[PDB]
């Protein structure tokens, strides 16, 4: 009884996230197709993603519950098509700002994908099923990225004939998204805890750390293109993304295998791996060798993902399934309020308008200041 | 926008040139203007760019350091200043005015100029 909704919910998850041209985005943008100056991408287009993502988060979170979780899933499917239909033919600098906004709906509606299964699957097969619908996404992204650097290198497929394949992939996602059973009970609508010492402190790092992780992911392909232009030398942005994603996936699984009490050795394991993220972000900025810059991304994603798993594990030890959403819903919002404050000052055109050359000395110093205040706070 | 180019001519090597582009007709919305170039028996080649709202520029790697592009929003014209010319720069230059708005198309540059003849020789 639990296999039909999950089989079609996993098929939708795999196809939607099997997008080959996620890595080859900025090489595609600032190329001979939609030639855009790197100053028109790092300070006018990309920042809009965090502005629209922040705005369309609470309205979508509340909407997902009132109207049962599926209608929002379809909306994410439609926004996937609109985003890649403008990314194919839409040209200009103003048309790309619209694309970023529609990618806010695509990413902000991801809450209704993971939370849907709770309302249609029996409560016993909730962690079993949740793993199935979460590992398929990682296997889809890793499989897609490997294919991107398999057609661009061995098959010679232009960067345009990856948005066509990406469009077909997401276009088939919105064919299974019409077949999920319609839930009949929501969590809050149709169905003080922060005072705990651990749930607040362990949420502060989750909110702050994930705020910088999203920013680094956004303005990273510009750094690769800056240290080695795509029109002059070969770019392995697909293999690097695939290896980094696999590195994070195995790292998160490792935390779920070792049995160590993350209470006496929890804070130390988060200061130490936060230093590694600060140390490996100066490398991406201080190193001229493009290969070293790839390794800096490889270590950062693998190291950071080893901490979001500890923080998520420590946050969720007493909360119910009915409390994760509004305890992981605030943090995913407070994390964005930090990102918008940082993007406005550091990146936005009206702010400091810092280029990408000097930006990573701030992100690399951002994670070195989330270490002193969570290590100098432990005072006796 | 009806871009008109002028200022072409044959110059001995090491002689600069200034090329203007009297953009006119719908100049309220021209969010860029990037000169191009088409050498004899070749294809159009990027040569410069200048934003209209601000002044951000982006020159081609080969031509950077001698080619200076400056907007003149008062009169709408866009000037390309070139120094240290050589007989390998003989080509024809074209403007390309990115009008603006939400559009679907094949090329970012909506409207194009006619073309000015530059013939470096001696
Ligand atoms: C059209 C568009 N697509 C994606 C992003 C954000 N983004 C780009 S790459 C990446 C991680 C994978 O490399 C993320 C989150 C954006 N701002 N605009």
Task: Check A91 against B56: CB less than 8 A apart.
Answer: no
- DSSP-assigned states of every residue in A191-233: --GGGSHHHHHHHHHHHHHHHHHHHHHHTSHHHHHHHS-TTTS
Q: Is B29 helix (H, G, I), strand (E, B) or coil?
A: coil
- CATH (domain of A217): 1.20.1250
State whether the beta carbon of A49 lies less than 6 angstroms from ligand 1. yes
Residues of A in contact with B108 (CB under 8 A): 34-36, 91-92
Instruction: Verify that A205 and A257 share a domain, yes or no.
Output: yes
- Which atom from ligand 1 is nearest to the alpha carbon of A23? 13
Instruction: Verify that A205 and A184 share a domain, yes or no.
Output: no
- CATH (domain of B65): 2.60.40.10
Q: How many domains are contained in chain A?
A: 2
Task: Check A39 against B58: CB less than 8 A apart.
Answer: yes
CA distance linking residue A288 with residue A285, whole number of Å: 8
Check residue A264 and report its DSSP letter. Answer: T
CA distance linking residue A15 with residue A7, whole number of Å: 12
> To what resolution in angstroms was this structure determined?
3.5
B31 at interface of A, judged by CB pairs closer than 8 A: yes
Domain of A258 in residue numbering reads as: 192-380
Q: Is A25 helix (H, G, I), strand (E, B) or coil?
A: coil
Q: From start to end of chain A, where are the E strands? A: 90-91
What was the structure determination method? cryo-EM
CA distance linking residue A357 with residue A32, whole number of Å: 23
Gyration radius of chain B over CA positions: 14
Check residue B3 and report its DSSP letter. Answer: -
**Residue B58 dihedral angles phi and psi, to the nearest 5°:** -155, 105
State whether the beta carbon of A218 lies less than 6 angstroms from ligand 1. yes
Instruction: Verify that A211 and A160 share a domain, yes or no.
Output: no
**HEC string for A76-120:** HHHHHHHHHHHCCCEECCHHHHHHHHHHHHHHHCCHHHHCHHHHH
Q: What's the CA-to-centroid distance between A22 and ligand 1, angstroms?
A: 7
Q: How many domains are contained in chain B?
A: 1
Q: What's the CA-to-centroid distance between A100 and ligand 1, angstroms?
A: 9
CA distance linking residue A251 with residue A248, whole number of Å: 5
Instruction: Verify that A225 and A110 share a domain, yes or no.
Output: no
Q: How many Å lie between the alpha carbon of A96 and the closest alpha carbon of chain B? A: 9
Instruction: Verify that A71 and A182 share a domain, yes or no.
Output: yes
Check residue A125 and report its DSSP letter. Answer: G
Domain of B27 in residue numbering reads as: 1-122
Instruction: Verify that A202 and A96 share a domain, yes or no.
Output: no
- CATH (domain of A138): 1.20.1250.20
Residue with tokens 């798993």: A309
Instruction: Verify that A203 and A167 share a domain, yes or no.
Output: no
CA distance linking residue A337 with residue A88, whole number of Å: 31
Instruction: Verify that A315 and A221 share a domain, yes or no.
Output: yes
CA distance linking residue A27 with residue A149, whole number of Å: 13
Instruction: Verify that A118 and A263 share a domain, yes or no.
Output: no
Instruction: Verify that A186 and A67 share a domain, yes or no.
Output: yes
Select from A191, A216, A235 the last residue of a domain.
A191
């Amino acid at each position: 009884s639990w296999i039909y909704p999950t089989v079609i919910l996993c098929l939708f998850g795999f196809f939607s996230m099997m997008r080959p041209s996620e890595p080859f985005l900025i090489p595609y943008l600032s190329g001979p197709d939609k030639q855009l100056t790197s100053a028109e991408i790092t300070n006018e287009i990309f920042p809009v993603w965090t502005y629209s993502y922040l705005v369309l988060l609470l309205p979508v979170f509340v909407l997902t519950d009132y109207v049962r979780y599926k209608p929002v899933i379809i909306l994410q499917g439609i926004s996937f098509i609109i985003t890649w239909l403008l990314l194919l033919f839409g040209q200009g600098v103003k048309t790309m700002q619209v694309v970023e906004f529609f990618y806010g709906m695509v990413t902000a509606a991801e809450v209704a994908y993971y939370a849907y299964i709770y309302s249609v699957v029996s409560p016993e097969h909730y962690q079993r099923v949740s793993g199935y619908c979460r590992s398929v996404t990682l296997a889809a992204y890793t499989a897609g990225s490997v294919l991107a650097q398999l057609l661009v290198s061995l098959a010679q497929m232009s960067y345009f004939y990856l948005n066509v394949i990406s469009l077909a992939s997401v276009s088939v996602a919105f064919l299974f998204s019409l077949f999920l059973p319609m839930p009949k009970k929501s969590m809050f609508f149709h169905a003080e805890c922060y005072s705990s010492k651990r749930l607040f402190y362990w949420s502060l790092w989750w909110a702050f750390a994930t705020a910088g992780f999203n920013q680094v992911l956004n303005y990273v392909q510009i750094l690769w293109d800056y240290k080695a232009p795509s029109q002059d030398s070969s770019i392995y942005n697909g293999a690097v993304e695939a290896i980094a994603t696999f590195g994070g996936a195995v790292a998160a699984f490792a935390v779920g295998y070792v049995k160590v009490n993350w209470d006496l050795l929890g804070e130390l394991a988060l200061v130490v791996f936060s230093v590694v993220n600060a140390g490996s972000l100066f490398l991406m900025h201080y190193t001229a060798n493009i290969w070293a810059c790839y390794a800096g991304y490889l270590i950062f994603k693998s190291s950071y993902m080893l901490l979001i798993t500890i923080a998520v594990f420590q946050i969720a030890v007493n909360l119910n399934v009915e409390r994760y959403a509004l305890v992981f819903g605030i943090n995913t919002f407070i994390a964005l309020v930090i990102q918008t404050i940082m993007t406005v000052i550091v990146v936005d055109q009206r702010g400091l308008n810092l280029p990408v050359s000097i930006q990573f000395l701030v992100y690399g110093s951002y994670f070195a200041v989330i270490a002193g205040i969570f290590l100098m706070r432990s005072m006796y | 926008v009806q871009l008109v180019e002028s200022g072409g001519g044959l110059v001995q090597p090491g002689d600069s040139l200034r090329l203007s582009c009297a953009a006119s007709g719908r100049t309220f919305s021209i969010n860029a203007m990037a000169w191009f170039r088409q050498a004899p028996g070749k294809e159009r080649e990027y040569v410069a760019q200048i934003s209209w709202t601000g002044g951000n520029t982006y020159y081609a790697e080969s031509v950077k350091g001698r080619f200076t592009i400056s907007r003149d929003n008062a009169k709408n014209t866009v000037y390309l200043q070139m120094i240290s010319l050589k007989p390998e720069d003989t080509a024809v230059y074209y403007c390309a005015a990115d009008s603006g708005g939400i559009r679907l198309g094949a090329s970012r540059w909506n409207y194009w100029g006619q073309g000015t003849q530059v013939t470096v020789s001696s």
